[PDB]
Amino acid sequence: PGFVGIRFCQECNNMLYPKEDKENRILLYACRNCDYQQEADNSCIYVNKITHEVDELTQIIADVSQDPTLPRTEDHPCQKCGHKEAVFFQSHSARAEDAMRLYYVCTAPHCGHRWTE
Amino acid sequence: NNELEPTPGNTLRQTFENQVNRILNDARDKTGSSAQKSLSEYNNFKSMVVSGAKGSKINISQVIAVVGQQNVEGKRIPFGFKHRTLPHFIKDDYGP
Protein backbone atom coordinates (compact mmCIF):
# COMPACT_ATOMS: atom_id res chain seq x y z
CA PRO A 1 0.00 0.00 0.00
CA GLY A 2 0.93 3.68 0.14
CA PHE A 3 0.87 6.61 2.52
CA VAL A 4 -1.64 9.45 2.26
CA GLY A 5 -0.94 13.15 2.65
CA ILE A 6 -3.07 16.02 3.87
CA ARG A 7 -5.88 17.31 1.70
CA PHE A 8 -5.69 21.09 2.02
CA CYS A 9 -8.46 23.67 2.04
CA GLN A 10 -6.97 25.88 -0.65
CA GLU A 11 -8.70 29.24 -0.28
CA CYS A 12 -7.82 29.70 3.41
CA ASN A 13 -4.67 27.57 2.97
CA ASN A 14 -5.57 25.20 5.81
CA MET A 15 -5.95 21.43 6.11
CA LEU A 16 -9.04 19.22 5.95
CA TYR A 17 -10.30 16.49 8.28
CA PRO A 18 -12.21 13.43 6.99
CA LYS A 19 -15.87 13.32 8.04
CA GLU A 20 -18.51 10.83 6.99
CA ASP A 21 -21.69 11.74 5.11
CA LYS A 22 -24.80 10.04 6.46
CA GLU A 23 -27.05 10.83 3.50
CA ASN A 24 -24.92 9.13 0.82
CA ARG A 25 -22.30 7.11 2.76
CA ILE A 26 -19.24 8.93 1.41
CA LEU A 27 -16.20 10.51 3.06
CA LEU A 28 -15.58 14.25 2.73
CA TYR A 29 -12.46 16.13 3.78
CA ALA A 30 -13.90 19.33 5.25
CA CYS A 31 -12.26 22.38 6.80
CA ARG A 32 -12.71 23.32 10.44
CA ASN A 33 -11.50 26.91 10.04
CA CYS A 34 -14.19 27.46 7.39
CA ASP A 35 -16.69 25.46 5.31
CA TYR A 36 -14.86 23.79 2.42
CA GLN A 37 -15.34 20.19 1.30
CA GLN A 38 -13.44 17.82 -0.98
CA GLU A 39 -14.43 14.28 -1.92
CA ALA A 40 -12.34 11.51 -0.36
CA ASP A 41 -10.26 10.07 -3.20
CA ASN A 42 -9.44 6.80 -1.40
CA SER A 43 -10.85 4.93 1.58
CA CYS A 44 -7.39 4.63 3.18
CA ILE A 45 -7.21 7.63 5.52
CA TYR A 46 -4.57 6.44 8.00
CA VAL A 47 -1.88 3.79 7.61
CA ASN A 48 0.96 2.53 9.81
CA LYS A 49 3.86 0.69 8.18
CA ILE A 50 5.55 -1.09 11.09
CA THR A 51 7.92 -3.48 9.32
CA HIS A 52 10.00 -0.41 8.40
CA GLU A 53 10.69 -1.94 4.98
CA VAL A 54 11.34 1.34 3.18
CA ASP A 55 13.09 1.69 -0.16
CA GLU A 56 16.20 3.40 1.18
CA LEU A 57 17.31 4.06 -2.41
CA THR A 58 14.93 7.02 -2.53
CA GLN A 59 16.40 8.41 0.69
CA ILE A 60 19.91 7.84 -0.69
CA ILE A 61 21.12 10.85 -2.68
CA ALA A 62 23.46 10.64 -5.66
CA ASP A 63 25.44 13.70 -4.51
CA VAL A 64 27.43 11.52 -2.10
CA SER A 65 29.15 10.03 -5.15
CA GLN A 66 31.83 12.74 -5.24
CA ASP A 67 33.00 12.49 -1.63
CA PRO A 68 36.64 11.35 -1.25
CA THR A 69 36.32 9.60 2.12
CA LEU A 70 33.96 6.89 0.89
CA PRO A 71 35.42 3.75 -0.69
CA ARG A 72 35.59 3.30 -4.45
CA THR A 73 35.44 0.20 -6.64
CA GLU A 74 34.90 -0.91 -10.23
CA ASP A 75 33.34 -4.36 -9.78
CA HIS A 76 29.75 -3.42 -10.66
CA PRO A 77 29.14 -0.81 -13.40
CA CYS A 78 26.33 1.71 -13.66
CA GLN A 79 23.44 0.00 -15.40
CA LYS A 80 22.07 2.79 -17.58
CA CYS A 81 25.37 4.52 -18.42
CA GLY A 82 27.58 1.43 -18.13
CA HIS A 83 30.19 3.34 -16.12
CA LYS A 84 32.55 0.94 -14.36
CA GLU A 85 33.34 2.95 -11.23
CA ALA A 86 30.94 2.77 -8.29
CA VAL A 87 31.02 3.78 -4.62
CA PHE A 88 29.61 1.32 -2.08
CA PHE A 89 28.62 2.23 1.46
CA GLN A 90 26.30 1.50 4.39
CA SER A 91 22.92 2.74 5.62
CA HIS A 92 23.97 5.01 8.51
CA SER A 93 20.23 4.98 9.31
CA ALA A 94 19.06 3.58 12.63
CA ARG A 95 17.10 0.32 12.93
CA ALA A 96 18.54 -0.56 9.51
CA GLU A 97 22.19 -1.38 10.30
CA ASP A 98 21.06 -4.76 11.66
CA ALA A 99 21.59 -6.05 8.10
CA MET A 100 24.83 -5.29 6.26
CA ARG A 101 23.48 -3.92 2.98
CA LEU A 102 25.79 -2.44 0.35
CA TYR A 103 24.50 0.59 -1.55
CA TYR A 104 26.23 1.49 -4.82
CA VAL A 105 26.24 4.90 -6.52
CA CYS A 106 27.83 5.44 -9.92
CA THR A 107 30.85 7.74 -9.99
CA ALA A 108 29.93 9.15 -13.41
CA PRO A 109 28.47 12.65 -12.91
CA HIS A 110 25.09 13.67 -14.29
CA CYS A 111 23.72 10.13 -13.98
CA GLY A 112 23.38 9.92 -10.20
CA HIS A 113 22.42 6.26 -10.53
CA ARG A 114 21.90 4.39 -7.26
CA TRP A 115 21.12 0.75 -6.60
CA THR A 116 21.55 -2.18 -4.24
CA GLU A 117 23.15 -5.40 -5.47
CA ASN B 1 27.56 -9.88 0.30
CA ASN B 2 24.93 -11.08 2.82
CA GLU B 3 25.63 -14.83 2.75
CA LEU B 4 26.07 -14.91 6.54
CA GLU B 5 23.42 -16.98 8.30
CA PRO B 6 22.50 -15.06 11.47
CA THR B 7 22.88 -17.12 14.60
CA PRO B 8 19.53 -17.84 16.29
CA GLY B 9 18.79 -15.69 19.32
CA ASN B 10 21.02 -12.81 18.22
CA THR B 11 21.31 -10.35 15.36
CA LEU B 12 23.48 -10.83 12.29
CA ARG B 13 25.51 -7.93 13.65
CA GLN B 14 26.36 -9.54 17.03
CA THR B 15 27.00 -12.78 15.16
CA PHE B 16 29.60 -10.96 13.08
CA GLU B 17 31.38 -9.52 16.11
CA ASN B 18 31.28 -12.92 17.79
CA GLN B 19 32.86 -14.58 14.76
CA VAL B 20 35.58 -11.93 14.47
CA ASN B 21 36.35 -12.16 18.18
CA ARG B 22 36.51 -15.95 17.94
CA ILE B 23 38.97 -15.75 15.05
CA LEU B 24 41.22 -13.27 16.82
CA ASN B 25 41.08 -15.12 20.14
CA ASP B 26 42.11 -18.34 18.42
CA ALA B 27 44.94 -16.56 16.61
CA ARG B 28 46.25 -15.04 19.83
CA ASP B 29 46.03 -18.34 21.70
CA LYS B 30 47.92 -20.23 19.00
CA THR B 31 50.51 -17.46 18.78
CA GLY B 32 51.12 -17.45 22.52
CA SER B 33 51.39 -21.22 22.66
CA SER B 34 53.92 -21.28 19.81
CA ALA B 35 55.93 -18.45 21.37
CA GLN B 36 56.14 -19.82 24.91
CA LYS B 37 56.89 -23.24 23.42
CA SER B 38 60.45 -22.26 22.47
CA LEU B 39 62.52 -20.37 25.04
CA SER B 40 65.58 -22.61 25.56
CA GLU B 41 64.92 -22.78 29.32
CA TYR B 42 67.74 -20.26 29.79
CA ASN B 43 65.71 -17.08 29.30
CA ASN B 44 65.42 -15.07 32.49
CA PHE B 45 61.84 -14.22 31.54
CA LYS B 46 61.13 -17.94 31.62
CA SER B 47 63.06 -18.29 34.87
CA MET B 48 60.98 -15.66 36.63
CA VAL B 49 57.62 -16.76 35.23
CA VAL B 50 58.29 -20.45 35.96
CA SER B 51 59.28 -19.54 39.50
CA GLY B 52 56.05 -17.52 39.56
CA ALA B 53 57.73 -14.62 41.36
CA LYS B 54 56.73 -11.76 39.06
CA GLY B 55 54.56 -12.03 35.96
CA SER B 56 52.36 -14.57 34.24
CA LYS B 57 52.36 -16.84 31.22
CA ILE B 58 50.49 -14.27 29.13
CA ASN B 59 53.19 -11.64 29.90
CA ILE B 60 55.77 -12.94 27.41
CA SER B 61 53.49 -13.29 24.40
CA GLN B 62 52.97 -9.52 24.34
CA VAL B 63 56.68 -8.70 24.25
CA ILE B 64 57.83 -11.52 21.97
CA ALA B 65 55.05 -12.64 19.62
CA VAL B 66 52.24 -10.07 19.46
CA VAL B 67 50.32 -7.62 21.65
CA GLY B 68 46.84 -9.00 21.07
CA GLN B 69 43.54 -7.22 20.69
CA GLN B 70 42.81 -4.21 22.90
CA ASN B 71 39.41 -3.43 24.37
CA VAL B 72 37.45 -0.49 25.72
CA GLU B 73 34.42 -1.23 27.89
CA GLY B 74 34.73 -4.85 26.80
CA LYS B 75 34.33 -4.57 23.03
CA ARG B 76 35.97 -3.37 19.84
CA ILE B 77 37.16 0.23 19.77
CA PRO B 78 34.08 2.30 18.86
CA PHE B 79 33.46 4.51 15.84
CA GLY B 80 34.38 7.74 17.58
CA PHE B 81 34.36 9.59 14.27
CA LYS B 82 31.73 8.94 11.62
CA HIS B 83 31.84 5.14 11.41
CA ARG B 84 35.65 5.14 11.34
CA THR B 85 37.90 4.86 14.37
CA LEU B 86 40.66 7.16 13.10
CA PRO B 87 40.82 9.38 10.01
CA HIS B 88 43.76 7.30 8.76
CA PHE B 89 41.09 4.71 7.89
CA ILE B 90 38.20 4.60 5.45
CA LYS B 91 34.52 4.77 6.30
CA ASP B 92 32.89 1.46 7.25
CA ASP B 93 35.89 -0.84 7.57
CA TYR B 94 36.05 -3.64 10.13
CA GLY B 95 39.65 -4.79 9.74
CA PRO B 96 41.31 -5.84 13.00
Next chain:
Amino acid sequence: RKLRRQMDIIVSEVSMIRDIREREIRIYTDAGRICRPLLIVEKQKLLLKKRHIDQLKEREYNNYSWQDLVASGVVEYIDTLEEETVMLAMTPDDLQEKEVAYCSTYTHCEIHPSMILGVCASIIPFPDHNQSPRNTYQSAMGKQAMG
Protein backbone atom coordinates in the same frame (compact mmCIF):
# COMPACT_ATOMS: atom_id res chain seq x y z
CA ARG C 1 39.36 26.23 -0.11
CA LYS C 2 41.61 28.02 -2.59
CA LEU C 3 40.73 31.49 -1.32
CA ARG C 4 41.43 30.39 2.26
CA ARG C 5 44.79 28.99 1.17
CA GLN C 6 45.57 32.37 -0.41
CA MET C 7 44.23 34.08 2.76
CA ASP C 8 43.08 37.00 0.63
CA ILE C 9 39.70 37.37 2.37
CA ILE C 10 39.09 33.98 4.03
CA VAL C 11 41.69 33.79 6.77
CA SER C 12 43.77 30.63 7.01
CA GLU C 13 42.42 29.77 10.47
CA VAL C 14 38.69 29.67 9.74
CA SER C 15 37.37 26.21 8.89
CA MET C 16 34.53 24.94 6.70
CA ILE C 17 32.91 21.53 7.12
CA ARG C 18 30.82 20.24 4.21
CA ASP C 19 28.54 17.44 5.34
CA ILE C 20 27.89 15.40 2.20
CA ARG C 21 25.68 12.65 3.60
CA GLU C 22 23.39 15.49 4.70
CA ARG C 23 22.76 18.56 2.55
CA GLU C 24 24.53 21.20 4.61
CA ILE C 25 27.78 23.13 4.93
CA ARG C 26 29.02 25.06 7.96
CA ILE C 27 31.65 27.76 8.48
CA TYR C 28 33.18 28.14 11.94
CA THR C 29 35.00 31.36 12.85
CA ASP C 30 34.25 31.58 16.58
CA ALA C 31 37.24 31.43 18.90
CA GLY C 32 38.14 28.47 21.06
CA ARG C 33 38.65 25.80 18.41
CA ILE C 34 41.69 23.52 18.38
CA CYS C 35 43.57 22.77 15.17
CA ARG C 36 46.95 21.60 13.91
CA PRO C 37 48.88 22.03 10.66
CA LEU C 38 48.93 19.36 7.97
CA LEU C 39 50.30 18.79 4.50
CA ILE C 40 47.96 19.23 1.54
CA VAL C 41 47.87 16.75 -1.33
CA GLU C 42 45.92 17.35 -4.55
CA LYS C 43 46.83 14.42 -6.79
CA GLN C 44 48.46 11.19 -5.64
CA LYS C 45 51.57 13.37 -5.21
CA LEU C 46 51.98 15.90 -2.40
CA LEU C 47 52.27 19.65 -2.87
CA LEU C 48 55.52 20.05 -0.89
CA LYS C 49 57.82 20.04 -3.89
CA LYS C 50 61.57 19.86 -3.42
CA ARG C 51 61.93 23.55 -4.32
CA HIS C 52 60.29 24.91 -1.17
CA ILE C 53 62.51 22.97 1.24
CA ASP C 54 65.49 24.40 -0.63
CA GLN C 55 64.61 27.98 0.31
CA LEU C 56 63.50 26.92 3.78
CA LYS C 57 66.80 25.22 4.63
CA GLU C 58 68.63 28.48 3.85
CA ARG C 59 66.95 30.28 6.73
CA GLU C 60 68.13 33.52 8.39
CA TYR C 61 69.00 34.77 4.90
CA ASN C 62 65.76 34.59 2.91
CA ASN C 63 63.70 35.53 5.97
CA TYR C 64 61.62 32.59 4.73
CA SER C 65 58.92 31.79 7.29
CA TRP C 66 56.43 29.10 8.18
CA GLN C 67 53.90 31.86 7.58
CA ASP C 68 55.32 32.15 4.07
CA LEU C 69 54.75 28.41 3.74
CA VAL C 70 51.14 28.95 4.78
CA ALA C 71 50.89 31.63 2.09
CA SER C 72 52.37 29.19 -0.43
CA GLY C 73 49.43 27.04 0.59
CA VAL C 74 51.13 23.66 0.83
CA VAL C 75 50.21 23.23 4.52
CA GLU C 76 46.99 24.25 6.22
CA TYR C 77 45.36 24.31 9.64
CA ILE C 78 42.84 21.56 10.35
CA ASP C 79 40.29 21.51 13.16
CA THR C 80 38.52 18.43 14.48
CA LEU C 81 35.27 19.29 12.72
CA GLU C 82 36.92 19.32 9.30
CA GLU C 83 39.07 16.34 10.28
CA GLU C 84 35.84 14.40 10.71
CA THR C 85 35.24 14.37 6.94
CA VAL C 86 38.67 14.12 5.29
CA MET C 87 40.91 11.15 4.64
CA LEU C 88 44.47 11.26 5.98
CA ALA C 89 47.64 9.83 4.45
CA MET C 90 49.88 8.59 7.23
CA THR C 91 53.35 8.60 5.66
CA PRO C 92 53.73 10.22 2.23
CA ASP C 93 56.96 8.30 1.70
CA ASP C 94 54.99 5.05 2.06
CA LEU C 95 51.22 5.59 1.78
CA GLN C 96 50.43 7.92 -1.12
CA GLU C 97 52.91 6.06 -3.34
CA LYS C 98 51.22 3.80 -5.86
CA GLU C 99 50.96 0.29 -4.44
CA VAL C 100 48.26 -2.26 -3.68
CA ALA C 101 45.58 0.40 -3.51
CA TYR C 102 43.92 1.20 -0.19
CA CYS C 103 41.70 4.07 -1.31
CA SER C 104 43.85 6.26 -3.61
CA THR C 105 41.84 9.34 -2.55
CA TYR C 106 44.01 10.81 0.20
CA THR C 107 43.49 14.51 0.87
CA HIS C 108 45.97 15.40 3.64
CA CYS C 109 49.28 14.04 4.86
CA GLU C 110 50.78 14.09 8.34
CA ILE C 111 53.94 16.06 9.07
CA HIS C 112 55.10 13.38 11.50
CA PRO C 113 53.33 11.04 13.95
CA SER C 114 55.75 12.03 16.72
CA MET C 115 53.82 15.31 16.76
CA ILE C 116 50.86 13.74 18.56
CA LEU C 117 52.88 13.40 21.75
CA GLY C 118 52.95 16.17 24.32
CA VAL C 119 55.56 18.44 25.83
CA CYS C 120 56.31 16.23 28.84
CA ALA C 121 55.99 12.81 27.21
CA SER C 122 57.93 13.74 24.06
CA ILE C 123 61.13 13.37 26.07
CA ILE C 124 60.52 9.64 26.55
CA PRO C 125 62.75 7.63 24.19
CA PHE C 126 61.16 4.71 22.37
CA PRO C 127 57.65 5.23 23.76
CA ASP C 128 56.47 2.74 21.15
CA HIS C 129 58.13 0.01 23.24
CA ASN C 130 56.57 0.70 26.66
CA GLN C 131 53.23 -0.23 28.16
CA SER C 132 51.12 2.91 28.21
CA PRO C 133 50.53 3.24 31.99
CA ARG C 134 54.30 3.31 32.40
CA ASN C 135 54.42 6.11 29.83
CA THR C 136 51.86 8.07 31.83
CA TYR C 137 53.78 7.58 35.07
CA GLN C 138 56.99 8.72 33.38
CA SER C 139 55.29 11.78 31.93
CA ALA C 140 53.94 12.64 35.38
CA MET C 141 57.39 12.16 36.94
CA GLY C 142 59.18 14.30 34.38
CA LYS C 143 57.61 17.42 35.95
CA GLN C 144 59.66 16.72 39.10
CA ALA C 145 63.11 15.83 37.76
CA MET C 146 65.25 18.55 39.31
CA GLY C 147 67.65 20.36 37.03
Next chain:
Amino acid sequence: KDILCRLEHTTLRKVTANTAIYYDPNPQSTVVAEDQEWVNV
Protein backbone atom coordinates in the same frame (compact mmCIF):
# COMPACT_ATOMS: atom_id res chain seq x y z
CA LYS D 1 11.51 -23.77 23.94
CA ASP D 2 7.80 -24.47 24.45
CA ILE D 3 8.15 -23.64 28.14
CA LEU D 4 10.30 -20.68 27.11
CA CYS D 5 7.57 -19.23 24.90
CA ARG D 6 5.14 -19.96 27.74
CA LEU D 7 7.16 -17.88 30.22
CA GLU D 8 8.82 -15.06 28.26
CA HIS D 9 6.64 -11.98 27.95
CA THR D 10 5.08 -11.52 24.52
CA THR D 11 3.37 -8.36 23.28
CA LEU D 12 1.39 -7.42 20.20
CA ARG D 13 4.06 -4.75 19.65
CA LYS D 14 6.68 -7.36 18.74
CA VAL D 15 4.34 -9.65 16.79
CA THR D 16 2.39 -7.30 14.50
CA ALA D 17 3.85 -6.93 11.02
CA ASN D 18 1.82 -3.77 10.35
CA THR D 19 -1.57 -2.12 10.74
CA ALA D 20 -4.00 0.32 9.14
CA ILE D 21 -7.62 1.49 9.16
CA TYR D 22 -10.08 1.65 6.27
CA TYR D 23 -13.56 3.16 6.09
CA ASP D 24 -15.62 0.27 4.68
CA PRO D 25 -19.32 0.91 5.40
CA ASN D 26 -20.29 -2.18 3.39
CA PRO D 27 -19.01 -5.33 5.16
CA GLN D 28 -19.42 -7.42 2.00
CA SER D 29 -17.21 -5.11 -0.09
CA THR D 30 -13.79 -4.15 1.28
CA VAL D 31 -10.82 -2.19 -0.03
CA VAL D 32 -8.58 -5.20 0.61
CA ALA D 33 -11.37 -7.41 -0.78
CA GLU D 34 -9.71 -10.44 0.80
CA ASP D 35 -11.35 -13.86 0.88
CA GLN D 36 -12.28 -13.45 4.55
CA GLU D 37 -14.92 -10.81 3.80
CA TRP D 38 -17.13 -13.51 2.25
CA VAL D 39 -16.57 -15.74 5.28
CA ASN D 40 -17.57 -12.89 7.58
CA VAL D 41 -20.68 -12.05 5.55
Next chain:
Amino acid sequence: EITPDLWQEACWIVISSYFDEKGLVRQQLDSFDE
Protein backbone atom coordinates in the same frame (compact mmCIF):
# COMPACT_ATOMS: atom_id res chain seq x y z
CA GLU E 1 61.40 16.37 -6.77
CA ILE E 2 60.49 15.07 -3.31
CA THR E 3 62.39 11.91 -2.39
CA PRO E 4 61.19 9.23 0.06
CA ASP E 5 64.66 8.77 1.52
CA LEU E 6 65.18 12.51 2.09
CA TRP E 7 61.65 12.87 3.47
CA GLN E 8 63.00 12.43 7.00
CA GLU E 9 65.25 15.48 6.95
CA ALA E 10 62.65 17.38 4.92
CA CYS E 11 59.88 16.89 7.48
CA TRP E 12 62.19 17.58 10.40
CA ILE E 13 63.42 20.85 8.89
CA VAL E 14 59.80 21.82 8.31
CA ILE E 15 59.05 21.17 11.98
CA SER E 16 62.15 23.10 13.02
CA SER E 17 61.01 26.10 11.01
CA TYR E 18 57.51 25.92 12.45
CA PHE E 19 58.69 25.85 16.06
CA ASP E 20 61.42 28.46 15.57
CA GLU E 21 58.69 30.68 14.16
CA LYS E 22 55.94 30.10 16.71
CA GLY E 23 57.36 28.88 20.01
CA LEU E 24 55.67 26.90 22.77
CA VAL E 25 53.37 29.55 24.27
CA ARG E 26 51.91 31.05 21.12
CA GLN E 27 48.21 30.53 21.77
CA GLN E 28 48.70 31.94 25.28
CA LEU E 29 50.33 35.10 23.93
CA ASP E 30 47.98 35.44 20.96
CA SER E 31 44.75 35.13 22.94
CA PHE E 32 45.84 37.90 25.30
CA ASP E 33 46.98 40.00 22.35
CA GLU E 34 43.54 39.72 20.75
Next chain:
Amino acid sequence: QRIVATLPYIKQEVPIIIVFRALGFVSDRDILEHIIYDFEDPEMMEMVKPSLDEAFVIQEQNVALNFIGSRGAKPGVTKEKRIKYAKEVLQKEMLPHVGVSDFCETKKAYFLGYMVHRLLLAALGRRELDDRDHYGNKR
Protein backbone atom coordinates in the same frame (compact mmCIF):
# COMPACT_ATOMS: atom_id res chain seq x y z
CA GLN F 1 3.61 11.44 20.86
CA ARG F 2 3.95 15.23 21.05
CA ILE F 3 6.78 17.76 21.21
CA VAL F 4 7.15 20.44 23.89
CA ALA F 5 9.75 23.13 24.60
CA THR F 6 11.51 24.47 27.68
CA LEU F 7 12.44 28.16 27.58
CA PRO F 8 14.18 30.53 30.00
CA TYR F 9 12.06 32.47 32.47
CA ILE F 10 9.24 29.98 31.82
CA LYS F 11 7.95 27.60 34.50
CA GLN F 12 5.92 25.40 32.11
CA GLU F 13 6.46 23.33 28.96
CA VAL F 14 4.78 25.30 26.18
CA PRO F 15 3.83 23.29 23.07
CA ILE F 16 5.76 24.03 19.89
CA ILE F 17 2.69 24.87 17.81
CA ILE F 18 1.40 27.57 20.16
CA VAL F 19 4.90 29.07 20.22
CA PHE F 20 4.85 29.21 16.42
CA ARG F 21 1.41 30.84 16.47
CA ALA F 22 2.60 33.41 19.02
CA LEU F 23 5.50 34.05 16.67
CA GLY F 24 2.84 34.81 14.08
CA PHE F 25 2.37 31.77 11.84
CA VAL F 26 -1.26 30.93 12.60
CA SER F 27 -1.77 29.10 9.30
CA ASP F 28 -1.16 25.38 8.85
CA ARG F 29 0.77 25.42 5.57
CA ASP F 30 3.37 27.94 6.73
CA ILE F 31 4.24 25.87 9.80
CA LEU F 32 4.23 22.67 7.75
CA GLU F 33 6.65 24.21 5.26
CA HIS F 34 8.91 25.46 8.05
CA ILE F 35 8.93 22.00 9.66
CA ILE F 36 9.32 19.82 6.54
CA TYR F 37 11.50 20.74 3.57
CA ASP F 38 10.90 17.60 1.48
CA PHE F 39 7.15 18.08 1.42
CA GLU F 40 6.73 14.41 0.36
CA ASP F 41 7.81 13.08 3.78
CA PRO F 42 4.74 11.22 5.05
CA GLU F 43 6.95 9.42 7.54
CA MET F 44 7.69 12.75 9.19
CA MET F 45 4.22 14.28 8.78
CA GLU F 46 2.68 11.32 10.70
CA MET F 47 5.18 11.98 13.55
CA VAL F 48 4.31 15.68 13.82
CA LYS F 49 0.56 15.15 13.37
CA PRO F 50 -0.18 14.64 17.11
CA SER F 51 1.42 17.89 18.29
CA LEU F 52 -0.27 19.96 15.60
CA ASP F 53 -3.47 18.14 16.60
CA GLU F 54 -3.18 19.70 20.08
CA ALA F 55 -2.88 23.50 19.87
CA PHE F 56 -5.23 23.84 16.88
CA VAL F 57 -7.88 25.13 19.30
CA ILE F 58 -5.78 28.29 19.64
CA GLN F 59 -5.48 30.19 16.35
CA GLU F 60 -4.76 33.79 17.42
CA GLN F 61 -1.24 35.09 17.96
CA ASN F 62 -2.53 37.35 20.73
CA VAL F 63 -4.16 34.36 22.44
CA ALA F 64 -0.90 32.42 22.19
CA LEU F 65 0.99 35.38 23.65
CA ASN F 66 -1.51 35.60 26.51
CA PHE F 67 -0.93 31.90 27.19
CA ILE F 68 2.83 32.50 27.14
CA GLY F 69 2.36 35.25 29.71
CA SER F 70 0.36 32.75 31.73
CA ARG F 71 2.62 30.50 33.80
CA GLY F 72 5.38 33.12 33.80
CA ALA F 73 7.85 34.31 36.42
CA LYS F 74 6.04 37.67 36.25
CA PRO F 75 2.88 36.65 34.38
CA GLY F 76 0.61 39.49 33.38
CA VAL F 77 -2.61 39.92 35.32
CA THR F 78 -4.49 39.85 32.01
CA LYS F 79 -3.54 39.93 28.33
CA GLU F 80 -2.59 43.53 29.10
CA LYS F 81 1.19 43.61 29.66
CA ARG F 82 1.16 39.81 29.52
CA ILE F 83 1.47 40.17 25.76
CA LYS F 84 4.34 42.57 26.47
CA TYR F 85 6.01 40.02 28.75
CA ALA F 86 5.63 37.37 26.05
CA LYS F 87 7.01 39.75 23.41
CA GLU F 88 10.11 40.59 25.42
CA VAL F 89 10.59 36.87 26.06
CA LEU F 90 10.37 36.19 22.32
CA GLN F 91 12.82 39.01 21.58
CA LYS F 92 15.62 38.90 24.15
CA GLU F 93 15.70 35.22 25.14
CA MET F 94 14.45 33.32 22.08
CA LEU F 95 17.69 32.40 20.30
CA PRO F 96 19.38 35.82 20.51
CA HIS F 97 22.39 34.58 18.53
CA VAL F 98 20.30 34.83 15.35
CA GLY F 99 19.35 38.41 16.27
CA VAL F 100 16.86 40.27 18.46
CA SER F 101 14.57 42.54 16.44
CA ASP F 102 11.24 42.74 14.65
CA PHE F 103 12.73 41.54 11.36
CA CYS F 104 14.48 38.56 13.00
CA GLU F 105 11.16 36.86 13.78
CA THR F 106 11.12 34.89 10.53
CA LYS F 107 14.74 33.78 10.94
CA LYS F 108 13.97 32.69 14.50
CA ALA F 109 11.06 30.65 13.17
CA TYR F 110 13.20 29.06 10.48
CA PHE F 111 15.94 28.02 12.90
CA LEU F 112 13.39 26.69 15.38
CA GLY F 113 11.98 24.65 12.52
CA TYR F 114 15.46 23.39 11.69
CA MET F 115 16.21 22.23 15.23
CA VAL F 116 12.87 20.49 15.56
CA HIS F 117 13.55 18.92 12.16
CA ARG F 118 16.82 17.57 13.54
CA LEU F 119 14.92 16.21 16.54
CA LEU F 120 12.43 14.45 14.28
CA LEU F 121 15.29 13.02 12.22
CA ALA F 122 16.88 11.72 15.41
CA ALA F 123 13.63 10.08 16.50
CA LEU F 124 13.17 8.55 13.04
CA GLY F 125 16.74 7.26 13.17
CA ARG F 126 17.93 8.71 9.86
CA ARG F 127 20.50 10.92 11.61
CA GLU F 128 22.79 9.68 14.37
CA LEU F 129 22.85 11.24 17.82
CA ASP F 130 25.83 13.15 19.21
CA ASP F 131 28.42 12.13 21.80
CA ARG F 132 29.29 14.92 24.21
CA ASP F 133 32.88 13.66 24.43
CA HIS F 134 33.29 14.59 20.75
CA TYR F 135 35.64 17.54 21.21
CA GLY F 136 34.27 18.68 17.87
CA ASN F 137 31.40 19.82 20.08
CA LYS F 138 33.66 21.30 22.77
CA ARG F 139 35.28 24.73 22.74
